[PDB]
């Protein structure tokens, strides 16, 4: 047991500074989530299809969290209210339940969006309306139950233990548990949105595989400017001489595969020597319905014009084909056929990044979270292991406003971005 006055670290200037932040951020949170709660109700009186579970839950948790926290905080730090062990822990249970319910609502919103990116086909089977409804109802009950623990025994005074140097009458073990659960589901939100951000960057650039087998380098000079036009169009190009390749699924993870081989053999129709081991090894390779386009050098003087392109086009059509366009068939010098090679390169590219505005919003979320939870929960971790000075206490007071800004910025992130809610609000005006 300690004294109420030890937890009131603010001076007449620090108190005014705080009251400003508490009542500005607080009033805007109260009013913002109210308008969101109003428009959700109006929307469900016209069109029933939109959910509003992860938008409404957060609107409740924020508004409630705000009224209780803003009022409690100011009454303790400005009015200097000295309340009973169970009376304090009751007002405290008000912020713990509400702020947990808030972060848990951002958690289920993130598990929804993670399932939609990871398994989009299985998402409609697993993420369903009746499963989702239960999820918020059990989110809320568990959150309340965590906040009810200090009032019915799990406190520093009843359980003769080490008291919190930031939270009056709270047991250090209750704190470690709450930081535990809060951190647990807070870190998942961070991972889920990192996964979604990763998955989107892999698709931003189309990966291209240009393999060529050339003798006098005439198909090399072709492939060099086939790869040039593609790299120019934002392609993750990787040109490989058929003399230095691996038949072990060479084409795996490639959007567009290009096989450039030169037509050789004097008496008969023959492939390039480099492309010869790669041709037989097409089975061991993937090409399992891959977008494959063919090219190659030959001569109009020769009986079988670019037959090597044909033999490949035939062997690919038997397997997964998906032949984007009819094979490019240049003569002895592609030097003047420059226009034809780039011309075919354009239309073969012509037959086939990442939604940055949505991806920006996911980056903002993490930025906001790291700023509003990181420092706050860091001072909470300090108290857990040992003591803390007057400075650490006063810094925590201004770190408390951090998550009040989070309560304010939330409607602007999720609700305001909802096309469904945006139209539902516009509805309320005359025609
Ligand atoms: C011995 C020999 C045989 C050839 N046979 C053919 C052929 O059957 N069909 C064809 O279209 N071109 C044929 N050509 C022409 C080649 O395709 C031409 O040299 C080509 O531009 C070489 O390209 P590369 O440097 O990529 O091998 C032949 C050329 C040589 C030297
Ligand atoms: C005072 C605070 C800390 C305790 C919360 C108690 C009350 C107000 C809670 C407990 C049960 C809660 C409900 C549980 C489930 C949901 C589903 C969600 O999609 C929207 C909010 C909604 C409908 C909650 C609204 C607020 C609620 C009625
Ligand atoms: C395990 C308990 C978690 C508490 C949530 C942390 C939170 C950021 C919400 C918080 C809660 C309480 C305070 C103030 C700590 C002061 O020491 C005493 C007055 C509290 C506000 C009154 C709550 O009813 C806080 O700054 C941050």
UniProtKB/Swiss-Prot annotation:
Entry's transmembrane regions: 16-41, 54-74, 87-111, 132-154, 173-198, 362-382, 395-416
Domain of life: Eukaryota
Topological domain ranges for the Cytoplasmic compartment: 42-53, 112-131
Gene Ontology molecular functions: cannabinoid receptor activity; G protein-coupled receptor activity; identical protein binding
Induction conditions: Up-regulated by endocannabinoid anandamide.
N-terminal signal peptide: none
Inhibition and activation profile: Hemopressin, a peptide derived from hemoglobin subunit alpha (HBA1 and/or HBA2), acts as an antagonist peptide: hemopressin-binding efficiently blocks cannabinoid receptor CNR1 and subsequent signaling.
GO biological process, one term: retrograde trans-synaptic signaling by endocannabinoid
Assigned keywords, A-Z: Cell membrane, Cell projection, G-protein coupled receptor, Glycoprotein, Lipoprotein, Membrane, Mitochondrion, Mitochondrion outer membrane, Neurodegeneration, Obesity, Palmitate, Phosphoprotein, Receptor, Synapse, Transducer, Transmembrane, Transmembrane helix
UniProt-annotated location(s): Cell membrane; Membrane raft; Mitochondrion outer membrane; Cell projection, Axon
Entry's Gene Ontology cellular component terms: actin cytoskeleton; cytoplasm; GABA-ergic synapse; glutamatergic synapse; growth cone; membrane raft; mitochondrial outer membrane; plasma membrane
Other comment: High-fat diet also increases the hepatic levels of CNR1 ligand anandamide, but not that of 2-arachidonoylglycerol.
Similarity field: Belongs to the G-protein coupled receptor 1 family.
Disorder: Obesity: A condition characterized by an increase of body weight beyond the limitation of skeletal and physical requirements, as the result of excessive accumulation of body fat. Dysfunction of the endogenous cannabinoid system including CNR1 has been implicated in the pathogenesis of a number of central nervous system disorders, including Huntington disease, Parkinson disease, and Alzheimer disease. In post-mortem brains from Huntington disease patients, a progressive CNR1 loss has been observed in the caudate nucleus, putamen, and substantia nigra pars reticulata, and altered expression and abnormal endocannabinoid levels precede motor symptoms in a disease mouse model.
Known partners and oligomeric status: Interacts (via C-terminus) with CNRIP1; this interaction attenuates constitutive, but not agonist-dependent, inhibition of voltage-gated Ca(2+) channels in neurons. Associates with G protein alpha subunits, including G(i) alpha-1/GNAI1, G(i) alpha-3/GNAI3 and G(o)-alpha/GNAO1; palmitoylation is important for interaction with GNAI3 and GNAO1.
Cited function: G-protein coupled receptor for endogenous cannabinoids (eCBs), including N-arachidonoylethanolamide (also called anandamide or AEA) and 2-arachidonoylglycerol (2-AG), as well as phytocannabinoids, such as delta(9)-tetrahydrocannabinol (THC). Mediates many cannabinoid-induced effects, acting, among others, on food intake, memory loss, gastrointestinal motility, catalepsy, ambulatory activity, anxiety, chronic pain. Signaling typically involves reduction in cyclic AMP.
Name of the protein: Cannabinoid receptor 1
GN (gene name): CNR1
């Amino acid at each position: 047991f300690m004294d109420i006055e030890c937890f009131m670290v603010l001076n007449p200037s620090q108190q005014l500074a705080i009251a400003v932040l508490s009542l500005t951020l607080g009033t805007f949170t109260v009013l913002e989530n109210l308008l969101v709660l109003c428009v959700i109700l109006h929307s469900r009186s016209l069109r029933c299809r939109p959910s509003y579970l992860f938008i409404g839950s957060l609107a409740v948790a924020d508004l409630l969290g705000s009224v209780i926290f803003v009022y409690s905080f100011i009454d303790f730090h400005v009015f200097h209210r000295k309340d009973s062990r169970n009376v304090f822990l009751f007002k405290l249970g008000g912020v713990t339940a509400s702020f947990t319910a808030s972060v848990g609502s951002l958690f289920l919103a993130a598990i929804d969006r993670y399932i939609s990116i990871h398994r989009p086909l299985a998402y409609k089977r697993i993420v369903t309306r009746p499963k989702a409804v239960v999820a918020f109802c059990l989110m809320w009950t568990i959150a309340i139950v965590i906040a009810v623990l200090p009032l019915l025994g799990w406190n520093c005074e009843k359980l003769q233990s080490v008291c919190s140097d930031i939270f009056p009458h709270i047991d250090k073990t209750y704190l470690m548990f709450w930081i535990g659960v809060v951190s647990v589901l807070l870190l998942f939100i961070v991972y889920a949105y990192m996964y979604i951000l990763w998955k989107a960057h892999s698709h931003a650039v189309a990966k291209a595989l240009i393999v060529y087998g050339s003798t006098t380098g005439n198909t090399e000079y072709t492939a060099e400017t086939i790869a040039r036009e593609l790299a120019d169009a934002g392609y993750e190009v990787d040109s490989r001489d058929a003399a230095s390749v691996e038949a072990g699924g060479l084409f795996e993870g490639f959007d567009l595969v290009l096989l450039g081989c030169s037509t050789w053999g004097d008496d008969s129709i023959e492939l390039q020597d480099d492309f010869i081991p790669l041709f037989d090894s097409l089975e061991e390779t993937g090409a399992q319905g891959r977008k494959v386009a063919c090219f190659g050098c030959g001569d109009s003087s020769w009986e079988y014009f670019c037959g090597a392109v044909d033999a490949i086009e035939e062997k690919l059509k038997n397997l997964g084909a998906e032949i984007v366009q009819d094979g490019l068939r240049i003569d002895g010098d592609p030097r003047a056929a420059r226009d034809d090679i780039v011309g075919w390169a354009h239309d073969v590219r012509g037959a086939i990044r990442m939604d940055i505005e949505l991806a920006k919003t996911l980056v903002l979320i993490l930025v906001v979270l790291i700023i509003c939870w990181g420092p706050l929960l860091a001072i909470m971790v300090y108290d857990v292991f040992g003591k803390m000075n007057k400075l650490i206490k006063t810094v925590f007071a201004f770190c408390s406003m951090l998550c009040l800004l989070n309560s304010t910025v939330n409607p602007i992130i999720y609700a305001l971005r909802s096309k469904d809610l945006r139209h539902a609000f516009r509805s309320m005006f005359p025609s």
